[PDB]
mmCIF file of C-alpha atoms in Angstrom:
data_model
loop_
_atom_site.group_PDB
_atom_site.id
_atom_site.type_symbol
_atom_site.label_atom_id
_atom_site.label_comp_id
_atom_site.label_asym_id
_atom_site.label_seq_id
_atom_site.Cartn_x
_atom_site.Cartn_y
_atom_site.Cartn_z
ATOM 1 C CA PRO A 10 99.471 63.858 119.906
ATOM 2 C CA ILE A 11 97.660 67.046 121.182
ATOM 3 C CA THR A 12 94.743 69.431 120.302
ATOM 4 C CA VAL A 13 95.500 73.201 119.923
ATOM 5 C CA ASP A 14 92.851 75.969 120.194
ATOM 6 C CA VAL A 15 93.407 78.657 117.522
ATOM 7 C CA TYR A 16 91.833 82.186 117.748
ATOM 8 C CA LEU A 17 91.882 84.494 114.732
ATOM 9 C CA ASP A 18 91.841 88.235 115.475
ATOM 10 C CA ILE A 19 90.552 89.235 112.046
ATOM 11 C CA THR A 20 91.046 92.997 111.420
ATOM 12 C CA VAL A 21 88.364 93.070 108.608
ATOM 13 C CA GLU A 22 85.050 94.588 109.870
ATOM 14 C CA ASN A 23 81.452 93.223 109.468
ATOM 15 C CA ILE A 24 82.608 89.858 108.009
ATOM 16 C CA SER A 25 79.773 87.953 106.226
ATOM 17 C CA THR A 26 81.778 84.897 104.931
ATOM 18 C CA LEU A 27 85.174 83.231 105.451
ATOM 19 C CA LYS A 28 85.913 81.770 101.940
ATOM 20 C CA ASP A 29 88.763 79.208 101.217
ATOM 21 C CA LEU A 30 90.303 80.072 104.676
ATOM 22 C CA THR A 31 93.017 77.738 106.012
ATOM 23 C CA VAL A 32 95.338 77.344 109.000
ATOM 24 C CA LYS A 33 98.576 75.593 107.940
ATOM 25 C CA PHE A 34 101.048 74.188 110.590
ATOM 26 C CA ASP A 35 104.517 73.694 108.909
ATOM 27 C CA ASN A 36 107.801 72.182 110.421
ATOM 28 C CA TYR A 37 111.336 70.982 109.333
ATOM 29 C CA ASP A 40 108.884 67.239 109.059
ATOM 30 C CA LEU A 41 105.206 67.646 110.153
ATOM 31 C CA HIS A 42 102.768 69.626 107.899
ATOM 32 C CA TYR A 43 99.081 70.147 108.798
ATOM 33 C CA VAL A 44 96.280 72.066 106.957
ATOM 34 C CA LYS A 45 92.925 72.877 108.636
ATOM 35 C CA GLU A 46 89.742 74.373 107.081
ATOM 36 C CA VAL A 47 88.316 77.423 108.921
ATOM 37 C CA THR A 48 84.816 78.993 108.776
ATOM 38 C CA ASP A 49 84.707 80.876 112.088
ATOM 39 C CA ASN A 50 86.879 83.212 114.257
ATOM 40 C CA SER A 51 88.041 80.210 116.366
ATOM 41 C CA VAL A 52 89.072 76.610 115.440
ATOM 42 C CA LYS A 53 90.182 73.525 117.476
ATOM 43 C CA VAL A 54 93.013 71.577 115.796
ATOM 44 C CA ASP A 55 93.212 67.852 116.891
ATOM 45 C CA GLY A 56 95.895 65.219 116.211
ATOM 46 C CA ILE A 57 98.829 67.678 116.056
ATOM 47 C CA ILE A 58 102.010 66.116 117.561
ATOM 48 C CA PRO A 59 103.790 68.573 120.005
ATOM 49 C CA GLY A 60 106.678 70.822 118.894
ATOM 50 C CA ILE A 61 107.418 74.339 117.598
ATOM 51 C CA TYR A 62 105.573 75.154 114.321
ATOM 52 C CA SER A 63 105.280 78.134 111.949
ATOM 53 C CA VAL A 64 101.489 78.708 111.763
ATOM 54 C CA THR A 65 100.047 80.578 108.725
ATOM 55 C CA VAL A 66 96.478 81.835 108.022
ATOM 56 C CA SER A 67 95.269 82.590 104.446
ATOM 57 C CA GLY A 68 91.884 82.960 102.767
ATOM 58 C CA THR A 69 89.175 85.453 101.812
ATOM 59 C CA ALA A 70 86.628 87.441 103.838
ATOM 60 C CA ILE A 71 83.513 89.026 102.290
ATOM 61 C CA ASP A 72 81.910 91.821 104.355
ATOM 62 C CA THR A 73 78.158 92.727 104.666
ATOM 63 C CA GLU A 74 78.543 95.205 101.719
ATOM 64 C CA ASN A 75 79.966 92.412 99.431
ATOM 65 C CA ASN A 76 83.552 93.838 99.720
ATOM 66 C CA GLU A 77 86.200 91.200 99.131
ATOM 67 C CA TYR A 78 89.333 90.941 101.270
ATOM 68 C CA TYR A 79 92.437 88.795 100.982
ATOM 69 C CA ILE A 80 93.185 87.979 104.622
ATOM 70 C CA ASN A 81 96.571 86.785 105.939
ATOM 71 C CA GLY A 82 98.350 86.146 109.232
ATOM 72 C CA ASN A 83 101.094 84.125 110.912
ATOM 73 C CA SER A 84 102.625 83.062 114.235
ATOM 74 C CA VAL A 85 106.320 82.220 113.848
ATOM 75 C CA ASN A 86 107.767 79.335 115.950
ATOM 76 C CA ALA A 87 104.794 78.954 118.359
ATOM 77 C CA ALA A 88 105.314 76.685 121.456
ATOM 78 C CA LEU A 89 102.786 73.870 120.893
ATOM 79 C CA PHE A 90 103.233 71.264 123.684
ATOM 80 C CA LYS A 91 100.236 71.338 126.114
ATOM 81 C CA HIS A 92 96.607 70.184 125.488
ATOM 82 C CA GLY A 93 94.621 72.226 124.793
ATOM 83 C CA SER A 94 97.277 74.953 124.296
ATOM 84 C CA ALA A 95 95.709 78.203 122.987
ATOM 85 C CA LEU A 96 97.258 80.184 120.074
ATOM 86 C CA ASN A 97 96.306 83.691 118.881
ATOM 87 C CA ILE A 98 96.959 84.836 115.273
ATOM 88 C CA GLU A 99 96.461 88.405 114.134
ATOM 89 C CA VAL A 100 94.808 88.241 110.696
ATOM 90 C CA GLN A 101 94.880 91.445 108.614
ATOM 91 C CA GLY A 102 92.865 92.100 105.462
ATOM 92 C CA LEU A 103 93.516 93.627 102.030
ATOM 93 C CA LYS A 104 90.486 95.110 100.170
ATOM 94 C CA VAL A 105 90.420 93.379 96.736
ATOM 95 C CA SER A 106 88.493 94.672 93.667
ATOM 96 C CA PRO A 107 87.322 91.453 91.920
ATOM 97 C CA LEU A 108 87.455 92.342 88.146
ATOM 98 C CA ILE A 109 89.690 95.238 87.153
ATOM 99 C CA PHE A 110 91.429 97.013 84.202
ATOM 100 C CA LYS A 111 95.008 95.686 84.491
ATOM 101 C CA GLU A 112 96.651 97.418 81.459
ATOM 102 C CA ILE A 113 95.284 99.912 78.871
ATOM 103 C CA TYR A 114 96.949 101.210 75.641
ATOM 104 C CA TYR A 115 95.040 103.972 73.745
ATOM 105 C CA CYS A 116 97.240 106.789 72.329
ATOM 106 C CA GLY A 117 98.334 105.077 69.103
ATOM 107 C CA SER A 118 101.890 104.890 67.740
ATOM 108 C CA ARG A 119 104.020 106.372 64.901
ATOM 109 C CA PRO A 120 105.266 104.226 61.954
ATOM 110 C CA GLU A 121 108.795 105.040 60.662
ATOM 111 C CA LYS A 122 107.196 104.721 57.172
ATOM 112 C CA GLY A 123 105.133 107.806 58.101
ATOM 113 C CA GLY A 124 101.634 108.759 59.256
ATOM 114 C CA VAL A 125 100.004 107.580 62.500
ATOM 115 C CA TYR A 126 98.666 104.190 63.700
ATOM 116 C CA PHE A 127 95.634 104.315 66.052
ATOM 117 C CA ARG A 128 94.525 100.622 65.590
ATOM 118 C CA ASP A 129 96.867 99.044 68.217
ATOM 119 C CA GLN A 130 94.414 100.042 71.109
ATOM 120 C CA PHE A 131 93.766 97.306 73.748
ATOM 121 C CA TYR A 132 92.199 96.788 77.251
ATOM 122 C CA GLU A 133 93.386 93.999 79.526
ATOM 123 C CA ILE A 134 90.863 92.803 82.184
ATOM 124 C CA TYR A 135 92.168 90.658 85.122
ATOM 125 C CA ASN A 136 90.456 88.283 87.575
ATOM 126 C CA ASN A 137 91.845 89.796 90.804
ATOM 127 C CA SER A 138 89.372 87.743 92.985
ATOM 128 C CA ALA A 139 89.530 84.458 95.066
ATOM 129 C CA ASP A 140 87.396 82.433 92.590
ATOM 130 C CA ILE A 141 86.393 81.892 88.902
ATOM 131 C CA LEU A 142 84.250 84.707 87.369
ATOM 132 C CA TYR A 143 82.157 84.475 84.217
ATOM 133 C CA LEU A 144 82.650 87.275 81.676
ATOM 134 C CA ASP A 145 79.394 86.380 79.847
ATOM 135 C CA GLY A 146 77.190 89.432 79.242
ATOM 136 C CA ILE A 147 79.409 91.877 81.210
ATOM 137 C CA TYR A 148 79.349 95.330 79.563
ATOM 138 C CA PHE A 149 82.136 97.623 78.336
ATOM 139 C CA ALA A 150 81.650 101.336 77.692
ATOM 140 C CA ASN A 151 83.591 104.572 77.020
ATOM 141 C CA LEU A 152 82.030 107.674 78.553
ATOM 142 C CA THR A 153 81.180 111.098 77.112
ATOM 143 C CA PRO A 154 82.719 113.709 76.473
ATOM 144 C CA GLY A 155 84.885 111.261 74.410
ATOM 145 C CA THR A 156 87.905 113.589 74.894
ATOM 146 C CA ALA A 157 88.292 115.295 78.291
ATOM 147 C CA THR A 158 86.978 118.884 78.403
ATOM 148 C CA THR A 159 86.129 121.629 80.922
ATOM 149 C CA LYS A 160 82.894 122.198 78.834
ATOM 150 C CA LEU A 161 80.292 120.649 81.139
ATOM 151 C CA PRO A 162 77.324 118.586 79.975
ATOM 152 C CA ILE A 163 73.963 119.161 81.732
ATOM 153 C CA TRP A 164 72.210 115.898 82.569
ATOM 154 C CA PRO A 165 68.495 115.474 83.594
ATOM 155 C CA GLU A 166 67.760 116.701 87.154
ATOM 156 C CA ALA A 167 65.766 113.444 87.789
ATOM 157 C CA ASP A 168 68.958 111.333 87.297
ATOM 158 C CA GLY A 169 70.622 112.879 90.360
ATOM 159 C CA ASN A 170 74.119 111.532 90.668
ATOM 160 C CA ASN A 171 73.232 107.881 89.997
ATOM 161 C CA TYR A 172 74.822 107.528 86.539
ATOM 162 C CA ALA A 173 77.851 107.722 84.239
ATOM 163 C CA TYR A 174 76.973 108.597 80.599
ATOM 164 C CA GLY A 175 78.157 106.215 77.867
ATOM 165 C CA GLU A 176 79.073 107.178 74.295
ATOM 166 C CA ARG A 177 79.243 103.501 73.029
ATOM 167 C CA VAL A 178 78.352 100.251 74.939
ATOM 168 C CA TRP A 179 79.474 96.665 74.127
ATOM 169 C CA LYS A 180 78.937 93.371 75.959
ATOM 170 C CA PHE A 181 80.656 90.032 76.082
ATOM 171 C CA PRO A 182 78.750 87.253 74.215
ATOM 172 C CA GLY A 183 77.879 83.942 75.976
ATOM 173 C CA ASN A 184 74.874 82.150 77.568
ATOM 174 C CA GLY A 185 76.220 82.675 81.133
ATOM 175 C CA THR A 186 78.896 79.968 81.529
ATOM 176 C CA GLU A 187 80.816 80.149 78.181
ATOM 177 C CA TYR A 188 83.616 82.628 79.158
ATOM 178 C CA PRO A 189 85.076 81.933 82.624
ATOM 179 C CA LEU A 190 88.137 83.714 83.960
ATOM 180 C CA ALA A 191 90.088 81.891 86.702
ATOM 181 C CA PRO A 192 92.020 83.815 89.436
ATOM 182 C CA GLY A 193 95.200 85.105 87.714
ATOM 183 C CA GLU A 194 93.738 84.995 84.179
ATOM 184 C CA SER A 195 93.396 88.024 81.898
ATOM 185 C CA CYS A 196 90.970 88.872 79.079
ATOM 186 C CA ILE A 197 92.404 91.217 76.443
ATOM 187 C CA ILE A 198 90.046 93.147 74.130
ATOM 188 C CA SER A 199 91.663 94.824 71.103
ATOM 189 C CA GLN A 200 90.155 97.431 68.743
ATOM 190 C CA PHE A 201 91.685 95.331 65.885
ATOM 191 C CA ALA A 202 93.094 92.013 67.141
ATOM 192 C CA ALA A 203 95.921 91.671 64.544
ATOM 193 C CA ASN A 204 99.732 91.602 64.297
ATOM 194 C CA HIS A 205 100.274 95.390 64.295
ATOM 195 C CA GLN A 206 104.033 94.851 63.807
ATOM 196 C CA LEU A 207 103.523 93.601 60.201
ATOM 197 C CA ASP A 208 105.004 95.935 57.531
ATOM 198 C CA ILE A 209 101.392 96.631 56.283
ATOM 199 C CA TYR A 210 100.415 98.073 59.719
ATOM 200 C CA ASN A 211 103.109 99.592 62.041
ATOM 201 C CA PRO A 212 106.420 97.691 62.643
ATOM 202 C CA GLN A 213 107.047 100.245 65.533
ATOM 203 C CA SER A 214 103.782 99.304 67.338
ATOM 204 C CA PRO A 215 104.624 98.001 70.867
ATOM 205 C CA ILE A 216 102.401 94.861 70.579
ATOM 206 C CA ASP A 217 101.101 91.981 68.377
ATOM 207 C CA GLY A 218 97.362 92.008 69.147
ATOM 208 C CA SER A 219 96.608 88.709 67.326
ATOM 209 C CA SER A 220 96.372 86.563 70.552
ATOM 210 C CA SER A 221 93.706 88.897 72.105
ATOM 211 C CA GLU A 222 90.728 86.868 73.423
ATOM 212 C CA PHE A 223 88.239 89.470 72.134
ATOM 213 C CA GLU A 224 88.049 92.320 69.606
ATOM 214 C CA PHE A 225 85.687 95.217 68.816
ATOM 215 C CA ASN A 226 85.086 94.173 65.166
ATOM 216 C CA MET A 227 82.986 96.666 63.108
ATOM 217 C CA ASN A 228 83.672 94.895 59.751
ATOM 218 C CA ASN A 229 86.174 97.409 58.393
ATOM 219 C CA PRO A 230 86.908 96.239 54.760
ATOM 220 C CA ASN A 231 90.613 97.180 55.004
ATOM 221 C CA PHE A 232 91.314 96.214 58.724
ATOM 222 C CA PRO A 233 88.971 93.217 58.838
ATOM 223 C CA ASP A 234 87.583 90.693 61.329
ATOM 224 C CA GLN A 235 90.306 88.600 63.016
ATOM 225 C CA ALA A 236 90.381 85.139 64.719
ATOM 226 C CA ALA A 237 89.718 86.918 68.096
ATOM 227 C CA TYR A 238 86.084 86.631 69.262
ATOM 228 C CA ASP A 239 83.707 89.540 68.652
ATOM 229 C CA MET A 240 82.216 91.799 71.327
ATOM 230 C CA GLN A 241 78.417 92.316 71.015
ATOM 231 C CA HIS A 242 77.445 95.907 70.055
ATOM 232 C CA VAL A 243 74.840 97.330 72.484
ATOM 233 C CA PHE A 244 74.401 101.110 72.085
ATOM 234 C CA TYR A 245 75.540 104.070 69.997
ATOM 235 C CA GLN A 246 73.595 107.335 69.640
ATOM 236 C CA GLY A 247 70.303 105.858 70.971
ATOM 237 C CA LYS A 248 70.467 102.781 68.681
ATOM 238 C CA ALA A 249 71.469 99.057 68.869
ATOM 239 C CA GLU A 250 73.181 99.228 65.403
ATOM 240 C CA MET A 251 76.925 99.896 65.015
ATOM 241 C CA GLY A 252 76.354 102.711 62.518
ATOM 242 C CA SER A 253 78.707 104.447 60.096
ATOM 243 C CA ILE A 254 81.927 104.666 62.247
ATOM 244 C CA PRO A 255 84.468 102.091 60.820
ATOM 245 C CA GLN A 256 86.577 101.397 64.031
ATOM 246 C CA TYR A 257 86.025 101.652 67.727
ATOM 247 C CA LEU A 258 88.580 104.358 68.265
ATOM 248 C CA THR A 259 88.474 105.722 71.818
ATOM 249 C CA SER A 260 90.232 109.168 72.380
ATOM 250 C CA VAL A 261 94.023 108.992 71.615
ATOM 251 C CA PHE A 262 94.132 111.787 74.328
ATOM 252 C CA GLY A 263 92.729 109.379 76.947
ATOM 253 C CA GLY A 264 89.219 108.005 77.242
ATOM 254 C CA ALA A 265 86.972 107.259 80.251
ATOM 255 C CA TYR A 266 86.521 103.415 80.430
ATOM 256 C CA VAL A 267 84.020 101.342 82.435
ATOM 257 C CA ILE A 268 83.167 97.641 82.811
ATOM 258 C CA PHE A 269 79.802 96.911 84.440
ATOM 259 C CA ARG A 270 77.483 94.018 85.344
ATOM 260 C CA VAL A 271 73.663 94.146 85.234
ATOM 261 C CA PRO A 272 72.261 91.865 88.011
ATOM 262 C CA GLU A 273 70.309 88.726 87.009
ATOM 263 C CA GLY A 274 66.646 89.773 87.290
ATOM 264 C CA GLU A 275 67.299 93.534 86.882
ATOM 265 C CA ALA A 276 66.564 95.032 83.451
ATOM 266 C CA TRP A 277 68.678 97.660 81.636
ATOM 267 C CA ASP A 278 67.962 98.723 78.023
ATOM 268 C CA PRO A 279 69.530 102.115 76.974
ATOM 269 C CA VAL A 280 68.149 101.598 73.414
ATOM 270 C CA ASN A 281 64.429 100.957 74.127
ATOM 271 C CA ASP A 282 64.027 102.342 77.672
ATOM 272 C CA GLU A 283 63.826 106.186 77.212
ATOM 273 C CA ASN A 284 64.575 106.550 80.960
ATOM 274 C CA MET A 285 68.023 104.897 80.269
ATOM 275 C CA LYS A 286 69.068 107.348 77.530
ATOM 276 C CA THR A 287 69.518 111.152 77.259
ATOM 277 C CA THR A 288 70.944 114.020 75.208
ATOM 278 C CA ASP A 289 73.293 116.684 76.698
ATOM 279 C CA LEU A 290 70.695 119.192 77.916
ATOM 280 C CA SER A 291 73.253 122.039 77.479
ATOM 281 C CA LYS A 292 72.927 121.486 73.674
ATOM 282 C CA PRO A 293 69.168 121.983 73.116
ATOM 283 C CA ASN A 294 69.427 121.337 69.367
ATOM 284 C CA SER A 295 71.256 117.967 70.008
ATOM 285 C CA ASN A 296 70.141 114.537 68.727
ATOM 286 C CA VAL A 297 73.156 112.684 70.240
ATOM 287 C CA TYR A 298 71.935 110.206 72.890
ATOM 288 C CA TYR A 299 74.021 108.720 75.695
ATOM 289 C CA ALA A 300 73.375 105.571 77.700
ATOM 290 C CA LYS A 301 72.595 105.960 81.388
ATOM 291 C CA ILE A 302 75.003 103.578 83.105
ATOM 292 C CA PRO A 303 74.014 102.973 86.795
ATOM 293 C CA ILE A 304 77.074 103.754 88.976
ATOM 294 C CA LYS A 305 75.953 100.833 91.263
ATOM 295 C CA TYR A 306 76.592 98.346 88.348
ATOM 296 C CA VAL A 307 80.201 99.446 87.701
ATOM 297 C CA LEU A 308 82.944 96.796 88.425
ATOM 298 C CA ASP A 309 85.872 99.126 87.388
ATOM 299 C CA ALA A 310 86.367 102.668 85.954
ATOM 300 C CA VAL A 311 89.543 104.365 84.596
ATOM 301 C CA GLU A 312 89.699 108.118 83.833
ATOM 302 C CA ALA A 313 92.426 108.760 81.259
ATOM 303 C CA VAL A 314 93.105 112.361 80.128
ATOM 304 C CA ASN A 315 95.535 114.414 77.909
ATOM 305 C CA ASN A 316 98.016 115.268 80.718
ATOM 306 C CA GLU A 317 98.217 116.299 84.412
ATOM 307 C CA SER A 318 96.335 119.615 83.605
ATOM 308 C CA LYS A 319 92.972 117.955 82.904
ATOM 309 C CA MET A 320 91.822 117.256 86.528
ATOM 310 C CA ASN A 321 88.891 119.764 86.162
ATOM 311 C CA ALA A 322 87.832 117.939 82.935
ATOM 312 C CA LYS A 323 86.682 114.565 84.499
ATOM 313 C CA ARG A 324 83.672 112.545 83.144
ATOM 314 C CA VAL A 325 84.005 109.453 85.414
ATOM 315 C CA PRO A 326 81.896 109.896 88.605
ATOM 316 C CA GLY A 327 84.259 110.486 91.596
ATOM 317 C CA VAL A 328 82.988 107.430 93.530
ATOM 318 C CA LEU A 329 84.235 105.221 90.612
ATOM 319 C CA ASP A 330 87.472 107.144 89.904
ATOM 320 C CA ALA A 331 88.464 110.212 92.047
ATOM 321 C CA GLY A 332 91.490 110.860 89.850
ATOM 322 C CA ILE A 333 93.015 111.066 86.347
ATOM 323 C CA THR A 334 95.754 109.035 84.561
ATOM 324 C CA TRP A 335 97.639 109.995 81.346
ATOM 325 C CA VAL A 336 100.651 109.403 79.050
ATOM 326 C CA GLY A 337 100.901 113.116 78.199
ATOM 327 C CA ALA A 338 101.095 112.746 74.428
ATOM 328 C CA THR A 339 99.314 111.277 71.425
ATOM 329 C CA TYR A 340 100.959 108.660 69.246
ATOM 330 C CA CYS A 341 103.887 108.010 71.565
ATOM 331 C CA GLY A 342 103.294 104.226 71.827
ATOM 332 C CA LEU A 343 102.993 104.331 75.637
ATOM 333 C CA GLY A 344 100.259 103.078 77.911
ATOM 334 C CA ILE A 345 99.152 102.749 81.534
ATOM 335 C CA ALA A 346 99.526 99.710 83.808
ATOM 336 C CA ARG A 347 97.800 99.015 87.182
ATOM 337 C CA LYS A 348 100.192 98.829 90.186
ATOM 338 C CA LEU A 349 100.590 95.640 92.207
ATOM 339 C CA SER A 350 99.314 95.537 95.806
ATOM 340 C CA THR A 351 102.549 95.718 97.836
ATOM 341 C CA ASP A 352 103.358 95.518 101.575
ATOM 342 C CA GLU A 353 105.190 98.208 103.727
ATOM 343 C CA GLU A 354 108.559 96.772 102.503
ATOM 344 C CA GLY A 355 107.320 97.152 98.872
ATOM 345 C CA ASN A 356 106.963 93.406 98.092
ATOM 346 C CA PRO A 357 103.954 92.193 95.949
ATOM 347 C CA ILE A 358 101.211 90.590 98.128
ATOM 348 C CA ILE A 359 100.687 87.019 96.696
ATOM 349 C CA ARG A 360 97.361 85.085 96.739
ATOM 350 C CA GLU A 361 98.936 81.859 98.098
ATOM 351 C CA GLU A 362 95.793 79.810 97.221
ATOM 352 C CA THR A 363 96.474 80.389 93.481
ATOM 353 C CA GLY A 364 100.068 81.753 93.565
ATOM 354 C CA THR A 365 98.911 84.937 91.752
ATOM 355 C CA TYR A 366 99.317 88.713 91.870
ATOM 356 C CA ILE A 367 96.803 91.123 93.416
ATOM 357 C CA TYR A 368 96.628 94.536 91.709
ATOM 358 C CA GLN A 369 96.091 97.828 93.587
ATOM 359 C CA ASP A 370 92.654 99.501 93.252
ATOM 360 C CA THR A 371 91.726 102.477 95.461
ATOM 361 C CA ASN A 372 89.296 104.023 92.822
ATOM 362 C CA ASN A 373 91.942 106.678 91.976
ATOM 363 C CA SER A 374 93.772 106.359 88.650
ATOM 364 C CA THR A 375 96.346 109.046 89.618
ATOM 365 C CA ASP A 376 97.459 106.563 92.335
ATOM 366 C CA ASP A 377 96.637 103.086 90.907
ATOM 367 C CA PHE A 378 98.379 103.332 87.507
ATOM 368 C CA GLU A 379 101.976 103.512 86.333
ATOM 369 C CA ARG A 380 102.016 106.121 83.519
ATOM 370 C CA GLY A 381 103.869 106.105 80.187
ATOM 371 C CA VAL A 382 104.948 102.418 80.287
ATOM 372 C CA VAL A 383 105.859 100.476 77.133
ATOM 373 C CA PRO A 384 102.609 98.456 76.487
ATOM 374 C CA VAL A 385 102.878 94.737 77.328
ATOM 375 C CA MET A 386 100.188 92.036 76.889
ATOM 376 C CA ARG A 387 99.774 89.630 79.893
ATOM 377 C CA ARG A 388 102.461 91.504 81.936
ATOM 378 C CA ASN A 389 103.705 89.863 85.237
ATOM 379 C CA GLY A 390 102.630 86.398 84.038
ATOM 380 C CA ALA A 391 98.888 86.959 83.600
ATOM 381 C CA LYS A 392 97.477 83.662 82.211
ATOM 382 C CA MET A 393 95.572 83.211 78.924
ATOM 383 C CA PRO A 394 92.136 81.456 79.443
ATOM 384 C CA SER A 395 91.799 77.893 78.073
ATOM 385 C CA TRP A 396 89.021 79.065 75.594
ATOM 386 C CA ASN A 397 91.394 81.473 73.668
ATOM 387 C CA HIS A 398 90.977 81.134 69.843
ATOM 388 C CA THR A 399 94.717 80.255 69.353
ATOM 389 C CA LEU A 400 94.405 77.049 71.520
#
């Protein structure tokens, strides 16, 4: 029975918190787990021998950046008291709530025509703890379709905003829609079985099990069991208007999810400072919502093809690149890449046994292009509050 001094050389800078951090001491049969809140920990009652020591947890820096931190010391010689052990702990920057998979270009039925109603957006809890989706916003940015034609925004705005075409929000009082680490929330344009003969048997997915949908009460493609997103803004108004479906560009849209802090106010409908026309079109009456860049949780710039890099509408700090599928109605989407190590193996959040997805705020780099769309790919879990359960 001995006490071992452990020192963690954490590679993450300006650490503010050490969340769910543990030091495990395994052996072929003594197994110890110790809670850690500082750079150094004393471990009592450990019987001498050679152990494989592992460090795992989360660090939050002074700028609220989240890191999955990990380290190990293989077959350490633990015999003396108080023997000192040093573990190098490296960190992985983790974006808490991201766009995991997006399908937007529509598909082609064999029966003829086109099918643009199979569109969906899969949101993943990539963080160390439960997040509440309640009241989080969803928007597509303007120009709806990527173009080199540049809008002129008010000088007073500076470079503090993205400009939304249509804005939605999740319903809920604040604690109704939690997402646990490893859980996905899918939002469909029309949350139905697209593979039915009445729709498109060649559609890549059945959107019926989607948690949410952008219902606009289309008489012919009606409201489904999936829960409804709350409409926030369209052309300066709170009302949904005349458009029958929420069809984002089949050439690639610019997507954002954003959170307004509790206490802070944001009303693009009633606050005239939060809405604007394109000043390059002086006769315009089309109003866009001023989305503060500082509120954005994730942004994805999809475009027509690899030629549209000079046609971006997502601010560079949110997405420095462009992603694409290169064609309309090809039934192919985009999927976020997994965070892998040097050897190319997926980095696993051992606390939850879940995947961590790559996010460097560059869609050219973070997304696999032209994949066959899949819902809840790589075992993403459906939340307990899903309408089918």
